[PDB]
Symmetry: C2
Subunit: 394 residues, 2 copies
């Protein structure tokens, strides 16, 4: 089946310049028998290639290209079935963009290409081409954020309690500062939140969820929360199904020696979205009392900026699924960069969660994320503050 | 009940400078007896004001401020319930940011306030760092523009079980119609709801799909030329038959159109209930060469979910985000972000429901270039209606 593949990459600036002549000649000769057409753009630091051919042929080729030592940071932008070829001839065509002025490059692209009967700008491929030509250095990974330049550098269990909590740090690696801590519920045998809640009768889960937070506040009180925020997770129903859950929480945290503003409530958008009605008065009560609110797993399930017109949380936590393989996904890159900017304009704190590799950290940092939660830095620590690991140069 | 209100505004650059000393002292003296406190930041071109007090009190005051001729382009950034007063003991006070070095204004603020975990503080900081970001440029001021019409020939087409009205989608910078959207009408010219109500519930999917032959027939004999035709379809109308896509192909080709000329609008709400089923339709549409738009994007609480799982050719920004965008910092921020994301993904963005020049100007300022709305072109039954264009003064 006819398929289109588009990707972008960068050269190693410390190595000798890539022989574009050899590249394009061998590409051209290899592509024609395989029925591969397309175009390659080069701006001095970055490549941009459009490839058209069968799914199989492009799957084989792209694997070779991904492993090629002539370039790095290969980011896939589009991969789709196609009704017709935009590019004709063949060699692989190549434009050295350093030789073109303003719109000369688009003019040469339009010489031999066909984008159907409607204006070229109605074709996604052409829009991607024009964006690379206009500002291709936008998602060029900076030199200080190359992954290879970095490397990474006690408490008891409490079985007698009905539940216990693990604390995980949210960190700002750029300042080597812990930003806040999230409390994560654990069963009396050290089990996950899913096992904890399976052990509770269905009619008691909401009440358990709210009332377990007493143990989280007690822990946070016994630890030196030195002006650090504590995040807690709650089902919206746990706050809603109570005469005064907000007031209950208030008495609990103040009794533990915390302050309202020190406590942030984390709810997932999937659970928020499905009940605006009852969340508005809960959020209102939480606001007036002085507690904060985060949207957790933003990007997972149903996730929206339109959520923000109704109300604005204090913090958004970008779900691990947008973080996962962000280094190779032009889509995830664009989406996360957009969330970051929107939150800046709205005054909403943004945290990237599930950060497991330096690659993820570097690319998230390149799109404006400064706060991070993940196993790369700190794992959850049962009834205590864990060790934090910091990235350090080389 | 305590509340916080934040807005940013702009000076008139061509008028004599406002005596802010007098303004602020008068403000402070009036505010404090009413239980109102806050601060005013000024950078030479823009104001940023934080107000604190009862919902009633700030409602009343902000209404006076919105109508004050000393400024314009008043955009509200925040209005929320508050637990405590951040500016206790200050009726009003001005900080001229041009009188401080970096960090200096924020350091002063924190000496009479009563921090980066607070949203008001983050918004203050953002104004001090890059307040000019959503400053409406001078050539995009609504008073610098006027609409003028570029004759409509609608017709009744008998013998058909439905009709279609056409509304243009326009690119005003190039004074160009980008595409036409086909909007279904009853045999008597009534609304889509009126059309579908006359059809039996179990046959509505089939009718929705088969009605498109009449949209294609209309576009074909116009002639459509090099323009796109947007048609609206329920995802379920596409699943109903084995070769719904194959049928659409036949019908548009018989009407003399090309696959890449036809674009299918599905509403985000209808896609996100069923990710399954749609993948197989979408595959067939792509292989056939037809294009896809997400309609009313931002009305089902929206898309970040969707874009990883596919990317449409076009997104149409919902009319709710367009409405009052000229006074909503939140809506401006959201639309600006969608525009940037789509640009990066090579997705075409259209703003829907554009009714006023105020909306068009602000939409233009956040990067939108395609527009659909009564400001430019109203739907015309079985024909191409008249189109109005903004022209500069
Ligand atoms: N793969 C990966 N995972 C990472 C990484 N960093 C952190 N995590 C984990 O992601 C979960 C915390 O985020 P969450 O979205 O609040 O997700 C939590 C939260 O929703 C929740 N939960 C925790 N405590 C409570 C609670 O007290 N009440 C309610 N209703 N839910 C809770 O159950 C969910 C799953 O929690 P956990 O098993 O504790 O697992 C934790 C955590 O250990 C990473 O780098 N990679
Ligand atoms: N206030 C205001 N309204 C504006 C403005 N500009 C356009 N509109 C209107 O917004 C609707 C078109 O957008 P839609 O989201 O596709 O919304 C459409 C679409 O969902 C739909 N529809 C139309 N044709 C079909 C169809 O053939 N099949 C299906 N399933 N739905 C259809 O029914 C909806 C109602 O359509 P319409 O009555 O034709 O109303 C039209 C239109 O006249 C504006 O500036 N201000
Ligand atoms: C930016 C870039 C674009 C490339 N494009 C192609 C191409 O389109 N066709 C191709 O066969 N190889 C292309 N390659 C080269 C492949 O990565 C790989 O070196 C080559 O296909 C191996 O073929 P060989 O067996 O002849 O050595 C490209 C490499 C880079 C750096
Ligand atoms: C940037 C700006 C900020 C203002 N802030 C206040 C204020 O906080 N309190 C207030 O009473 N008026 C404020 N005003 C002035 C009002 O718009 C209005 O002129 C005044 O309150 C009318 O009441 P008065 O005639 O009793 O003074 C502000 C005006 C501008 C342009
Ligand atoms: Mn959480
Ligand atoms: Mn989470
Ligand atoms: Mn539509
Ligand atoms: Mn719409």
């Amino acid at each position: 089946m006819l398929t289109t593949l588009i990707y972008r990459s960068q050269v190693h600036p410390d190595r000798p310049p890539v022989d574009l002549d050899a590249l394009v000649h061998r590409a051209s000769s290899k592509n024609l028998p395989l029925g591969i057409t397309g175009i390659l753009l080069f701006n001095g630091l970055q490549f941009f290639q459009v490839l058209e051919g069968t799914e199989e042929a492009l799957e084989s080729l792209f694997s070779e290209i991904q492993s090629d030592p002539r370039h790095r940071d290969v980011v896939e932008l589009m991969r789709d079935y196609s009704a017709y070829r935009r590019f004709h001839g063949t060699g692989m065509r190549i434009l050295d963009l350093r030789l073109f002025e303003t719109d000369g490059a688009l003019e040469e692209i339009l010489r031999f290409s066909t984008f159907g009967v409607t204006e070229p700008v109605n074709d996604r491929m052409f829009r991607l081409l024009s964006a690379f030509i206009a500002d291709g250095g936008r998602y060029c990974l900076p030199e200080p954020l190359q992954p290879s330049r970095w490397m990474m550098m006690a408490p008891q269990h409490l079985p007698g309690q009905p539940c216990q909590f693990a604390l995980q740090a949210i960190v700002e690696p750029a300042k080597k500062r812990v930003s806040s801590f999230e409390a994560l519920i654990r069963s009396p045998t050290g089990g996950s939140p899913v096992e904890m809640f399976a052990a509770i009768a269905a009619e008691d889960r909401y009440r358990f969820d709210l009332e377990s937070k007493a143990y989280a506040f007690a822990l946070a009180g016994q630890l030196p929360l030195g002006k650090h925020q504590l995040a807690i997770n709650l089902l919206p129903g746990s706050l809603y199904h109570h005469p005064d859950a907000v007031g209950w929480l208030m008495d609990s945290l103040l009794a533990a020696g915390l302050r309202p503003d020190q406590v942030l409530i984390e709810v997932t958008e999937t659970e928020v979205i499905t009940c605006f009605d009852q969340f508005r008065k809960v959020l209102k009560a939480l606001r007036v009392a002085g507690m904060k609110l985060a949207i957790d797993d933003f990007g997972a399930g149903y996730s929206g900026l339109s959520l923000l017109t109704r109300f604005q949380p204090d913090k958004i936590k970008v779900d691990a699924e947008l973080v996962r393989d962000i280094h190779i996904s032009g889509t995830k890159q664009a989406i996360v960069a957009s969330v970051v900017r929107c939150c800046e304009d709205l005054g909403i704190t943004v945290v990237a969660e599930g950060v497991e590799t330096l690659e993820e950290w570097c690319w998230l940092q390149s799109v404006g994320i400064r706060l991070f939660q993940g196993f790369l830095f700190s794992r959850p620590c049962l009834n205590g503050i864990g060790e934090i690991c910091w990235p350090v140069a080389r």
